[PDB]
Ligand binder design. Structure first.
Ligand SMILES: [Ca+2]
Ligand SMILES: [Ca+2]
Ligand SMILES: [Ca+2]
Ligand SMILES: [Ca+2]
Ligand SMILES: [Ca+2]
Ligand SMILES: [Ca+2]
Ligand SMILES: [Ca+2]
Ligand SMILES: [Ca+2]
Ligand SMILES: [Ca+2]
Ligand SMILES: [Cl-]
Ligand SMILES: [Cl-]
Ligand SMILES: [Cl-]
Ligand SMILES: [Cl-]
Lengths: 213, 213
């Protein structure tokens, strides 16, 4: 059968609302006045009233802004009933696909990550790994693709930039010589995660690196 | 049967999340390891993952802040399954009632209301009626109870306060003499609606009153 195609709607629309999405129609409206209605989650069950349909015109409406991270797909049914009260079509599946906007900053899995490394390891040695997640799409876009960096290191002793971070994996490594527990037994690294693979919003956290004997 | 009572949770909770709500338990856990799960809108169907249950402990969790004006009541089912894979209880109804916080300001049904009145009507004469709605509860609290007032009138001719408004019905009336079309053919009233029956947040709109001949 011919049916309404899935309707794609970006999250966070500015309106105005109610917003026309697509117009339902039964061709039995030639012979009879038709009253349209819709059912399903988002229409007549939780969350109720996100979508509506204009009874006589068959216009499907979105009544407010959508949030992909709450519900990314709605599955509704359109109905068509004659003025005398008989259903004149089998209910039609209607799908609404909510598409992404970059509206989440990255979120570190901890506020303070802790790791350790032996003084005197080779430059290039992995120390630890930090992680930030991002609720946004990372399949079709970079909205949810996190890039990692180190913002600063304290103390600046002996050299200011003792560590680096793999920009995609969040693994922190030693890139210099000169680790010495007796001189500096612990470093605090301000670490950052930025979405749009580096071009977007940035969140900050801390990694503390204990220098072992 | 003994069952879990409806669980009341105010909207807009500050957490931390996940938040323990109530602990499910089958007393067959004496004889057998039990795995708990929950189903329904808010758990395994849209909106998915608002609630969860700890598999072994039976703790029901709320995972994020709720919004009474989106969904005010959730109807879930708790399940109890033995480690060998048999259901050992009939699923239990679980209700979550989301209680109100005053988080909506009043909203006027129009930005500009228009009415008219004959010059020379008696003081006390009704002119028009304006309306603001408020999404918040108005049954148990004043969160959704709107009080109306007039903020100002332009021009201030002949007297500054020609009209009043019924603080609950939003009906505007003439309270002075001296309406005269040839002198002032139209007035603009800045009107306000405030929730908590006057004690709360205030929204503003305009009513324009044409003086008829
Ligand atoms: Ca969103
Ligand atoms: Ca929501
Ligand atoms: Ca998003
Ligand atoms: Ca993002
Ligand atoms: Ca030493
Ligand atoms: Ca709310
Ligand atoms: Ca509320
Ligand atoms: Ca309110
Ligand atoms: Ca005159
Ligand atoms: Cl209509
Ligand atoms: Cl998308
Ligand atoms: Cl558990
Ligand atoms: Cl309430």
């Amino acid at each position: 059968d011919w049916v309404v195609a899935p309707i794609s709607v970006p999250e966070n629309g500015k309106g105005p609302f109610p917003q026309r999405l697509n117009q339902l129609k039964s061709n039995k409206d030639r012979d009879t006045k038709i009253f349209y209605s819709i059912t399903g989650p988002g229409a007549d069950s939780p969350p109720e009233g996100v979508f509506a349909v204009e009874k006589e015109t068959g216009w499907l409406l979105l009544n407010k802004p959508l949030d992909r991270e709450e519900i990314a797909k709605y599955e509704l049914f359109g109905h068509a009933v004659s003025e005398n009260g008989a259903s004149v079509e089998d209910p039609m599946n209607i799908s609404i696909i909510v598409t992404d906007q970059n509206d989440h900053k990255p979120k570190f899995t901890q506020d303070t990550f802790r790791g350790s490394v032996l003084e005197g390891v080779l430059p290039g040695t992995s120390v630890m790994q930090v992680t930030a997640t991002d609720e946004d799409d990372a399949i079709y876009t970079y909205n949810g693709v996190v890039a990692y960096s180190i913002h600063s290191q304290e103390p600046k002793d002996p050299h200011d930039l003792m560590f680096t971070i793999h920009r995609s994996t969040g693994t922190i490594s030693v890139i210099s010589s000169g680790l010495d527990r007796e001189k500096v037994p612990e470093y605090t690294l301000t670490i950052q995660a930025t979405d749009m693979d580096g071009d977007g919003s940035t969140t900050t956290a801390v990694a503390v690196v204990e220098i072992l004997d």
